Amino acid sequence: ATFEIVNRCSYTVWAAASKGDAALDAGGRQLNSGESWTINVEPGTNGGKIWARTDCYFDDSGSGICKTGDCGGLLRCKRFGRPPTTLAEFSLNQYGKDYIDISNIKGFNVPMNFSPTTRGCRGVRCAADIVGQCPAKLKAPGGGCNDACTVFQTSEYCCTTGKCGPTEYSRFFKRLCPDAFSYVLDKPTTVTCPGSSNYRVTFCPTA
Ligand SMILES: [Cl-]
């Protein structure tokens, strides 16, 4: 199924859609303000994230760097990004039931929306100004709020034991985005949908 990845910001991002060990369709392409981009995630992709990388520079070959969502310099993102990232997590068909969700488990970088394109379900969003209303010890240097996990690296933040709960750093991403995973275990905000359904991943929605 398809995934329109719309840039709606004022600044050029570099979208990216990948899984564990493989890119999706192409991998990730530059996006001037308003540029739309269509791809086709192979049906049955478990572990599919789409995100945006800001302040990236490249060369001909396809090898550079990104202040956010960097993934080994590979414009065509094969891996997941370097943490500080708002993710459109998804797993597709999964027993005739599709699964999508925004997440601030790996921080936040870009107000995102993950609406479905069909008549299958409602979508989600994460529009609020996190990066601005950031708590001091998260506002990353580059730009964007890292997550407590990546910043501090405690079991309580990154959830190793299995038994973890909300925090003040997780209750910041919740206060602002009530419809995205703050901590790794949060009362799932996932939305289930029909299998073989398409999606719009509008970065910077509402303007
Ligand atoms: Cl890091």
Pairing of strands 199-200, 3-4: parallel
Calculate how far, in angstroms, residue 108's C-alpha sits from the geometric centre of ligand 1: 14
The approach used to solve this structure was electron diffraction
For residue 122, the tally of other CB atoms under 10 A from its CB is: 8
CA nearest neighbour of 87 among 48, 36, 35: 48
Residue with token string 């901590």: 183
**Tokens in use for 194?**
């029909």
Calculate how far, in angstroms, residue 83's C-alpha sits from the geometric centre of ligand 1: 6
Residue with token string 């790794």: 184
Calculate how far, in angstroms, residue 69's C-alpha sits from the geometric centre of ligand 1: 11
Number of helical (H) and strand (E) elements in the chain, helices listed first = 3, 12
Domain range for 80: 1-207
CA nearest neighbour of 7 among 112, 144, 125, 162: 112
- Please list the residues that pair with 88 across neighbouring strands: 50, 102
| DSSP E strands, 86-144 | 87-91, 97-103, 115-116
Calculate how far, in angstroms, residue 82's C-alpha sits from the geometric centre of ligand 1: 6
- What domain count does the chain have? 1
- Distance CA(164)–CA(144), nearest Å, equals 24
Calculate how far, in angstroms, residue 148's C-alpha sits from the geometric centre of ligand 1: 12
- Distance CA(24)–CA(126), nearest Å, equals 23
- Distance CA(59)–CA(68), nearest Å, equals 18
Calculate how far, in angstroms, residue 81's C-alpha sits from the geometric centre of ligand 1: 10
- Distance CA(197)–CA(128), nearest Å, equals 27
Calculate how far, in angstroms, residue 2's C-alpha sits from the geometric centre of ligand 1: 31
Calculate how far, in angstroms, residue 84's C-alpha sits from the geometric centre of ligand 1: 8
Residue 94: how many CA atoms within 13 Å on its side-chain side? Answer: 15
Calculate how far, in angstroms, residue 150's C-alpha sits from the geometric centre of ligand 1: 6
